[PDB]
Amino acid sequence: TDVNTLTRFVMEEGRKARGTGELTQLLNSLCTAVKAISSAVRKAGIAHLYGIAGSKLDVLSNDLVMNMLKSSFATCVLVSEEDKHAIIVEPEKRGKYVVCFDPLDGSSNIDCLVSVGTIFGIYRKKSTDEPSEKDALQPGRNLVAAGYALYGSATMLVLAMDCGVNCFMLDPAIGEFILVDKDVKIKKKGKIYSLNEGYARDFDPAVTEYIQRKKFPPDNSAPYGARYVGSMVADVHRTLVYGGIFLYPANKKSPNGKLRLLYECNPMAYVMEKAGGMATTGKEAVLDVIPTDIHQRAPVILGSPDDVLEFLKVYEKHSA
Amino acid sequence: TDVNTLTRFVMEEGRKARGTGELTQLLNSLCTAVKAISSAVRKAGIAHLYGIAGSTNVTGDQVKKLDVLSNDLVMNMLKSSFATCVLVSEEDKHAIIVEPEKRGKYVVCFDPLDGSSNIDCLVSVGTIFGIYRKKSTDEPSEKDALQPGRNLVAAGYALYGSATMLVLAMDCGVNCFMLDPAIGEFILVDKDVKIKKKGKIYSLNEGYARDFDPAVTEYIQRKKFPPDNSAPYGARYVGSMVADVHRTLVYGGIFLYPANKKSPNGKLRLLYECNPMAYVMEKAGGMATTGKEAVLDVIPTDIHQRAPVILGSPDDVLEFLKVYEKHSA
Amino acid sequence: TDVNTLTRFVMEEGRKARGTGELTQLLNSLCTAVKAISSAVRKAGIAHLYGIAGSKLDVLSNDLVMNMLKSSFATCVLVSEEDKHAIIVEPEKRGKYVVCFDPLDGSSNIDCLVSVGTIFGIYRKKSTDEPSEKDALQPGRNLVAAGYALYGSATMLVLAMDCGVNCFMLDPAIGEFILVDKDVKIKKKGKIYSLNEGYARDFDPAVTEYIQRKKFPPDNSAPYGARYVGSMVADVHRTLVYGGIFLYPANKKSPNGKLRLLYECNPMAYVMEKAGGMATTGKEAVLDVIPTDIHQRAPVILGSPDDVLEFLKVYEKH
Amino acid sequence: DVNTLTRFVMEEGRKARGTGELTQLLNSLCTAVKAISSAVRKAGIAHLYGIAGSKLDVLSNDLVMNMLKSSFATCVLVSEEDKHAIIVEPEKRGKYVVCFDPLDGSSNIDCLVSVGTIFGIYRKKSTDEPSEKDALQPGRNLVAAGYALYGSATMLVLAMDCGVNCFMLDPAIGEFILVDKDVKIKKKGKIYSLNEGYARDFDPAVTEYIQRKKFPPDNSAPYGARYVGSMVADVHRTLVYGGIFLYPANKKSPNGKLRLLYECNPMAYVMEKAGGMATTGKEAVLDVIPTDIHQRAPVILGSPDDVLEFLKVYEKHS
Ligand SMILES: CCc1cc(Cl)c2[nH]c(C(=O)O)c(CCC(=O)O)c2c1
């Protein structure tokens, strides 16, 4: 076939949509930052920190995405896990899109060299007022585009839009993201479950039951396999590729979940839905929750449609 | 205080031991293979497989799955070290006997790309290696690999995760080296590393719960429902041994792969998964048990023999063994 | 100044026009190709050919640029040093642009690891006829965009358009061309002359005097320095950065010059003229020569204005 | 099958019944070459030009210096960057003297032309304490010499008693790969290399030799001219393709420009070990007895029949 790169793809989609080119420039600018995060995560230059010539990853990742999006002339408001407040882009470098991002998700346990990621979500400013944090408090339903970069065994960018979910592998030799999986869809039912079972004594009765139904199948089926990496980008990527269910529900330390709706839960929910999968808080869809805080936390149960539905049936047999 | 590379370290250690060079050349040939596996695992040249020059079919055997390419890289690099007689791998049913002209003294049992079953999900993967000496007089055979893990000369792993790190355990201790992909050199980042006495993380597939033996079932409940009114232990299971055991060494805690049903003598293979990681653990002040015995004290009968494995922080493995000893009989 | 990339620059400049989007894809396809050539010229994977798993550069350069420009859906006619006849692109992948390129200029001496390059010149199909070789026989004054890629100590793409000349360094760590020099303009007069002096016997009288005026200055000033790599991309790039003059004039073996108008002479003349410099054949401007063959050779004297005008004064005296 | 520099230096040291110090020195120096290559190809350039908001000759020196000191194999280190010999601290002192040029050609690195790292290794003459006199040895006493070319691709050329061996860097895995074994030069070439901008300040012998190549007296083809202005590149071309490289003596530079210890001597050893020659006009570069660490020497090196022809013309004018 002829090589389809991210750059050719984002240009072709904008040209067929006869668009301005601001969405294309955002995604190009974001992927140049993802390439730079990947170089830094794989530790290029570590010899210079250890004295080859005689002589931050969280922050650098944020500084890379921030600077690359501000110089895009395509963003107005930027929300980062790292920045406690929204960034309002200077007037002269302003564009029509609001971007909610998590620069290096999983960096908590990056000392063990566990898979880390960049989670992103793009909205349009619908308001007529001056750029403010309020332009970022849109429900996931209004997402123009979303996705994640995985810095695992190789680096991959998953781009979810209305065309579908597209998977691009970084070729470090040329710095190009090669489309390796087009219009990807999730399995209707998987065989893997993912959650921290260390919060067992703190779990909701409904979670406790669903987990025991996978370990000890009532329908005399095969017991599910357990996988929990501790990095949402890695756990959710395996959920898209292999199928199954990722859960981060309420515990006690975190009674509204740990994971953050705007730049963790909402982007992943958009990827899942566009890939024929589901994503709930237990009560509603992640994409239907209207936010009040940029750093608001939210429960997430995402994956293979039938597996999310099975969970929801247990929640129903326990709640309102 | 001053910089060091894997190459310099292994060459200086061999001169300090006034040695032949065979171990030093083996370890350098193994590390050249590890930089090559890293380049391919990070998908360098994938553009050529997707028509950047418009040519796929079967090109330069780059259509090989990364577990075959990894094995072919480790096998050809080790054979050309002039340091190997017998080579055991996860990919080859019978041991490889190295042609007389390239034969050396060491037996290597290795796992070329551990976790490759799920490499579609871009899971952290690794090369696990264990180096033994031929203590036999008979013509090189598979029996030369059937040595217990106490007889090991050196052992360790390459993790292909966020970054690529070689962990090389010897009698000098465990040394951790980071691959700088800019210069193609492993940089000594962590020296004579020691595992924590007690951790706060447990790692096992709890989807095998209905088949878990009572000792595993109790120990797990002790970490979720602690007696001491302590914080419950956290759960991490990547599903790649290299990744889970690396986290056990850096953060502390316990990695368990027990048995019963499906794989009933454990799953993980003793010669090229369990023993390598047990030597790293024991050289870092950690522990590695099958429950009944220490992994390193198991005398192997087959090269693809499996073993049960509970490894990590000394106090954590000892707590498990107390629970096991109550249910042992 | 804020950071810019080649891909960002080309998308911003192409957004300015309503745009078909074809020229932006063409330039981004040429960008991807140049990074591929750069990797292969720096000898990435050579260990595979020498036994790592125990299991061309000029041709591979041509195949990459040909395939990348065919799959841009923006090219109709492709002329290359490598192919004797022009390439007429398949109807389904056809666009409005005619690209004339030298895929790896200097690769005759690439065994000594000499600096090499990719020279490119993009024209618009101006005919209503079926795409043909004749669509490449446009004068250099009709160039829409031109430039080169130098694979030397580092890889740089120099892109010339109406907006002027912009120089972008490839950061191989991230695989991105970083804009390092904006709206570049050449020095008025330099201190370096560039030509193969082994042809002194077959040299035109005027070149003989110009070189004798650089070695033995008439203004009792400092003699010029001589640099000649034998790769045009290297010599013209030095001419642009440090100033001076590059000459490949006529001789006996090459009475109409050696370097090729369409994919060597014209592309480099556009970059020089967009940077406030000059490029002459002696008789006329390189860009004003109407091509008759796609492999037509042309004499070239390019560089710093005062230097090319001093040569032109001696040409008028002879 | 696969021969790397690591396996080469280890095998050659075992064939020499050696300690392992020189092997360590060459592994350490080759780590520094890889790190210079990364910097020279501008990896990270994006961090300088603002991708996240918020020297090459000095870096090259610092890399080579620290890698040679941490090798525990050096006692005296002479660089072009330091006016005084560096006496390695007693706690990492070894038995070898290294004279090196960290980035030869860096004057003109802004034009992205080929650059290099030139090196020469001697053994300490002393049995007492190390001094600059342990570096003031003639090139005959060299144990190992060579150069790293950062051109189209990165190559380390290592010359020893075993001969001259060429290693290509695979940037993908960071290994130097044996690609040309016991290399030897052409008996006669067809390329001459010199800055002809010094034509008025030239010796009558140099004037004649250059005229014999431009205007052949034997009705042979006139020779070609190549002068990159980076010695590493010009001498590598001379080795791979043949011919002559001349940085001769002017009346403005009576002892030449290029430095005996870390430019002329190292390249004279490579030429001699490849069946070529290297003269100052009066004597062999390797036979000259150094009196100053930054001493300049004239250098005419390359294919044997070409340097001999020069010497015949030098004799006529002596
Ligand atoms: C999947 C649909 C899509 C994809 C990409 Cl990549 C796009 N890029 C641009 C652009 O203008 O750059 C647009 C049009 C956006 C607008 O006008 O609503 C666009 C639409």
Ligand SMILES: CCc1cc(Cl)c2[nH]c(C(=O)O)c(CCC(=O)O)c2c1
């Ligand atoms: C830490 C101990 C060690 C480490 C390395 Cl890296 C070594 N390399 C070699 C070698 O001979 O190459 C030896 C000695 C071998 C022998 O004891 O038989 C050796 C010993």
Ligand SMILES: CCc1cc(Cl)c2[nH]c(C(=O)O)c(CCC(=O)O)c2c1
């Ligand atoms: C010379 C200034 C320029 C630069 C770039 Cl990068 C351009 N890109 C595009 C484009 O639309 O692709 C155009 C307009 C011509 C078309 O319609 O093809 C364009 C013009």
Ligand SMILES: CCc1cc(Cl)c2[nH]c(C(=O)O)c(CCC(=O)O)c2c1
């Ligand atoms: C081919 C000549 C050579 C090459 C290498 Cl690579 C060497 N390495 C070592 C060493 O000391 O390891 C020596 C010893 C000879 C000395 O003392 O100069 C040696 C000799």
Ligand SMILES: O=P(O)(O)OC[C@H]1O[C@](O)(COP(=O)(O)O)[C@@H](O)[C@@H]1O
């Ligand atoms: O450690 P826990 O409680 O199981 O939660 C891990 C979760 O926290 C996260 O790391 C997010 O937080 P960090 O970016 O600070 O690491 C998720 O990637 C991941 O799902």
Ligand SMILES: O=P(O)(O)OC[C@H]1O[C@](O)(COP(=O)(O)O)[C@@H](O)[C@@H]1O
């Ligand atoms: O899926 P399970 O049964 O939990 O087993 C996981 C184990 O299998 C392994 O992947 C080994 O198998 P592969 O090398 O074939 O993938 C271990 O690294 C890992 O601990």
Ligand SMILES: O=P(O)(O)OC[C@H]1O[C@](O)(COP(=O)(O)O)[C@@H](O)[C@@H]1O
């Ligand atoms: O060796 P000469 O006669 O000076 O010609 C050199 C010229 O030929 C070229 O090398 C072009 O030919 P190639 O593309 O075949 O190498 C120019 O790059 C250079 O200016």
Ligand SMILES: O=P(O)(O)OC[C@H]1O[C@](O)(COP(=O)(O)O)[C@@H](O)[C@@H]1O
């Ligand atoms: O420009 P000139 O006078 O011809 O000198 C060029 C010579 O100087 C050098 O550049 C050495 O000087 P630098 O190391 O300062 O660049 C040689 O590489 C080269 O042979």
